[PDB]
Amino acid sequence: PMSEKQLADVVERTVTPLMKAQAIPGMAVAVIYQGQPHYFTFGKADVAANKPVTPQTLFELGSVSKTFTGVLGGDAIARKEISLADPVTKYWPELTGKQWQGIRLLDLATYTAGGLPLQVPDNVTDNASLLRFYQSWQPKWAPGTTRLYANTSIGLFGSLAVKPSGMRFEQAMAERVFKPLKLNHTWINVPHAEESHYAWGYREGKAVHVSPGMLDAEAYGVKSNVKDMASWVMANMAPETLPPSTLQQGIALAQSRYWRVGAMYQGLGWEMLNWPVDVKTVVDGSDNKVALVPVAEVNPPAPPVKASWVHKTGSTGGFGSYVAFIPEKQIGIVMLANKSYPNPVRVETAYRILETL
Numbered sequence: 450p451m452s453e454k455q456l457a458d459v460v461e462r463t464v465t466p467l468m469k470a471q472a473i474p475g476m477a478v479a480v481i482y483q484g485q486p487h488y489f490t491f492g493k494a495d496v497a498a499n500k501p502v503t504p505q506t507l508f509e510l511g512s513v514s515k516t517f518t519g520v521l522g523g524d525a526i527a528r529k530e531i532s533l534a535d536p537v538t539k540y541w542p543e544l545t546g547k548q549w550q551g552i553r554l555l556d557l558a559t560y561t562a563g564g565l566p567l568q569v570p571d572n573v574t575d576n577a578s579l580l581r582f583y584q585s586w587q588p589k590w591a592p593g594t595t596r597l598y599a600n601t602s603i604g605l606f607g608s609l610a611v612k613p614s615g616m617r618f619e620q621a622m623a624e625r626v627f628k629p630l631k632l633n634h635t636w637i638n639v640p641h642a643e644e645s646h647y648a649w650g651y652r653e654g655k656a657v658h659v660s661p662g663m664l665d666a667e668a669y670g671v672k673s674n675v676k677d678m679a680s681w682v683m684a685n686m687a688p689e690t691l692p693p694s695t696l697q698q699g700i701a702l703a704q705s706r707y708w709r710v711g712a713m714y715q716g717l718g719w720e721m722l723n724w725p726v727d728v729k730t731v732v733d734g735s736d737n738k739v740a741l742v743p744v745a746e747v748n749p750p751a752p753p754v755k756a757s758w759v760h761k762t763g764s765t766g767g768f769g770s771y772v773a774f775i776p777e778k779q780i781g782i783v784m785l786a787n788k789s790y791p792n793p794v795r796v797e798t799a800y801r802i803l804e805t806l
């Protein structure tokens with residue numbers, strides 16, 4: 450086994466030239482190894498203010514937020530508040546168009562509604578406009594047959610999934626996922642009292658934070674530090690060490706396999722590949738194409754497979770994040786950066802570090 454000093458050398462020797470070549474100002478890395486988190490921090494959280502990254506620095510998780518959304522949805526299933534087989538119209542009856550009749554919560558959660566678009570338009574800022582947006586949508590393919598990664602898909606899933614709870618999405622997430630897991634520095638809205646910890650992201654050398662948008666919390670809006678994200682990876686890698694609960698059940702539902710595209714299996718938020726897998730296969734299996742692709746159905750959904758590479762990429766304008774873990778080996782990694790850099794490079798970096806363990 451690797452000593453703490455040897456592991457720090459592996460991470461530093463990889464991350465240092467990466468940050469220089471990509472012009473990433475700051476990064477926080479957690480390696481999960483032998484049951485323990487190991488934290489490594491580099492560079493600047495705020496370039497203009499010369500503030501260093503620390504384990505308390507908050508980063509925008511971007512689409513890694515969808516792993517929280519998927520687990521919250523799984524928790525709602527386990528509470529028997531929703532079913533993935535329910536029609537979307539059970540939770541939004543105003544969607545009366547014929548194109549919505551056959552669409553299920555499963556389709557929203559896993560991007561199979563038939564071509565819901567990537568983003569909510571920026572000029573959609575209220576519920577009447579969001580209703581008109583979904584009313585006007587014309588599918589390209591029958592539901593349950595294609596995948597098109599889309600914030601408007603799982604974003605709507607998250608908003609509908611919490612309706613039986615009576616809570617807004619942010620409240621439900623805090624009460625049912627963040628608090629039980631003691632993720633006390635993980636935020637959909639960063640409190641005023643925590644702003645000193647909030648890194649700036651950098652796009653073309655310019656400091657930027659994510660802008661509000663409808664369905665942002667569900668799809669790309671969580672902020673967290675490297676310690677909370679290590680805990681999140683530990684909880685999803687080893688949920689059997691948690692007490693029995695609907696949240697533990699929801700973790701299992703979110704790592705269940707619902708569809709297959711090539712070597713990648715779609716969970717709720719999480720994505721999975723069978724382990725062992727080569728790095729090139731993981732890279733080729735983590736491209737969210739602009740175009741639709743066909744899916745293979747996993748019916749019934751397959752329960753979580755310990756021999757899996759489980760991961761999620763995510764970015765905002767100014768941040769790039771990545772989480773991956775292998776339950777069979779009990780290793781995992783969190784990579785938080787305040788510049789967006791290519792997803793294949795995140796995969797390659799993570800894979801090389803985990804390979805040393």
Ligand SMILES: *C(=O)[C@@H](NC(=O)/C(=N\OC(C)(C)C(=O)O)c1csc(N)n1)[C@@H]1N=C(C(=O)O)C(=C)CS1
Nearest residue numbers: 511512513598600659669737762763764765766792
């Ligand atoms: C999660 O990270 C999602 N990312 C986004 O929604 C945002 N941008 O995605 C684009 C515009 C493609 C990008 O340049 O990164 C976003 C939220 S807020 C903000 N200022 N930008 C999905 N991320 C990917 C991915 O696989 O990396 C996709 C191609 C679909 S969107």
